[PDB]
Design a protein around this ligand. Structure first.
Ligand SMILES: Cc1cc2nc3c(=O)[nH]c(=O)nc-3n(C[C@H](O)[C@H](O)[C@H](O)COP(=O)(O)OP(=O)(O)OC[C@H]3O[C@@H](n4cnc5c(N)ncnc54)[C@H](O)[C@@H]3O)c2cc1C
Ligand SMILES: [Mn+2]
Length: 454
């Protein structure tokens, strides 16, 4: 990157907020994925939307790639600077604006995490429900299309994003539903907001997100239930869903994952395939829901069901990724993320469990089985290229299996670098060309996070 160009960057954001130091670039060259660190040529920290626009326009017109960077917790290599360029760390824009408790909405900048938002909402009766395990940027969650354990009841980011402020690749400012607008539904024109949710930084830079807030539940009960087999746990899950019990959370852990979480959290659950469950409602709803759910799990061989213990339960779940890595310190990991029609979920989870067992790989299974969806967390020796090939082969084959079942190769993590071939198979030639046309119209020079998604 030329010195005159670095100077121009410093004129916009100030010298403390531009760095070409190799250690800074290396920290921003990777995420939580196993994709090899690819350092940007520079990291830039804009202080407001005008500066984001000016940095984008400078990079775009000079032919310099732009990589938006939130909290760097992605798991598909989205922030890897595969073509070099300028990494734009957005987290100094960290303000909550426009809290509208009477409309159940809020506007947040990229430096606001879900925990920061809910802390600011303590005492209001409202909360934001979409809960990835990491304390991620909410605008980053909008960019990846994130979901979480609460999504089965409260929806994904796509369900809860009302409006987006986006700096387009050439610096133009777009408010996807109109500046300052927020409403529960619209038929006005084409839905631009939904195009940018799940775009992973390839269509523009999200500089604020308008989010739907939800009422705190009247009462909450959490429970665990252990099963003799994966099949029993997942059959129970499908029957709970088909009975339309409005569970707030329904998470599956296999025996390997349960053991890992036990050792990482001072939970001490029976080592067995397990459901973590949560119910929201009044005492009457809760009593009724608990009895219908216990009846269903009992029929499939579930054990008997088992506020600070609730926090430890979900803290252990949210840290399952780190619990899995701790089984073999020094390993990295790859995660699958398929989502299938729920009637096919028993087939593919039992099959995945059998394939993990039959192979020499170490893997644990956890996920949002309420949301078509589960993760296979596969461990990899960072210095064993053969094991890396086999893990990648395993992930690819699981992906194709989900696609054969009418599902999708990713329920929530996104495509980044890892799933680009699976995406092509998932939507076919016309779908690929259509997505390419959308990318080309918004990013003609192809400088917006190149090499990702498509
Ligand atoms: C322990 C753990 C648990 C997790 N659990 C979940 C889970 O349950 N569900 C889930 O969906 N994910 C989960 N994640 C993954 C990750 O937290 C989410 O994908 C999250 O949305 C990433 O946000 P980020 O800001 O950290 O992303 P980054 O890694 O910084 O960026 C991810 C991608 O989005 C782009 N991007 C980031 N910010 C912006 C922006 N403002 N505008 C435009 N593009 C942008 C980047 O260029 C990149 O392509 C988990 C991760 C960890 C480590
Ligand atoms: Mn998840």
């Amino acid at each position: 990157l030329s010195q005159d160009f670095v100077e121009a960057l410093k004129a916009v954001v100030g010298s403390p907020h531009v760095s070409t130091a190799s250690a800074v670039r290396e920290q921003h060259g990777h995420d939580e994925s196993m994709h090899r660190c690819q350092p940007p040529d520079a990291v830039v920290w804009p202080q407001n939307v005008d500066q984001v626009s000016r940095v984008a326009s400078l990079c775009y017109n000079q032919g310099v790639p732009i990589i938006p960077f939130g909290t760097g917790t992605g798991v598909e290599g989205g922030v890897c600077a595969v073509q070099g360029g300028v990494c734009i760390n957005l987290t100094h824009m960290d303000q909550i604006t426009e809290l509208n408790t009477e409309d159940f909405s809020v506007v947040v900048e990229p430096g606001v995490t879900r925990k920061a938002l809910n802390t600011h909402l303590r005492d209001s009766g409202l909360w934001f429900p979409v809960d990835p395990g990491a304390d991620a940027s909410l605008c980053g969650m909008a960019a990846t299309g994130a979901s979480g354990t609460n999504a089965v009841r409260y929806g994904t980011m796509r369900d809860n994003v009302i409006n987006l402020e986006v700096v387009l690749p050439d610096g133009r400012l777009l408010h996807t539903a109109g500046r300052g607008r927020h409403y529960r539904k619209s038929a006005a024109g084409y839905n631009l907001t939904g195009l940018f949710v799940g775009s992973e930084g390839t269509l523009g830079i999200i500089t604020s997100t308008t989010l739907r807030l939800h009422p705190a539940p009247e009462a909450t009960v959490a429970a665990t239930c252990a099963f003799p087999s994966v099949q029993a746990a997942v059959d129970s899950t499908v029957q709970i869903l088909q009975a339309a019990v409005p569970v707030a959370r329904i998470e599956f852990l296999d025996d390997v994952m349960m053991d890992a979480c036990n050792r990482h959290s001072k939970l001490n659950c029976p080592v067995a395939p397990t459901l973590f469950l949560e119910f929201h409602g009044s005492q009457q709803t809760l009593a009724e829901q608990l009895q219908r759910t216990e009846a269903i799990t009992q029929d499939n061989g579930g054990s008997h069901f088992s506020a600070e213990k609730r926090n430890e339960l979900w803290a252990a779940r949210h840290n399952a990724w780190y619990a899995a890595l701790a089984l073999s310190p020094g390993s990295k990991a790859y995660s699958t993320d398929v989502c299938v029609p729920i009637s096919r979920l028993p087939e593919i989870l039992v099959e995945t469990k059998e394939e993990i067992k039959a192979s020499k790989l170490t893997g644990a299974i956890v996920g949002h089985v309420g949301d078509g969806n589960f993760h296979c967390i596969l461990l990899v020796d960072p210095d064993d290229a053969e094991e890396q090939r086999r893990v990648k082969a395993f992930a690819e084959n699981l992906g194709r299996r989900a696609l054969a079942l009418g599902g999708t190769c990713t329920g929530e993590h996104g495509i980044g670098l890892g799933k680009r071939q699976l995406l092509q198979e998932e939507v076919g030639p016309v779908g690929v060309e259509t997505m390419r046309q959308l990318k080309n119209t918004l990013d003609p020079r192809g400088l917006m996070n190149p090499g990702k998604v498509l």
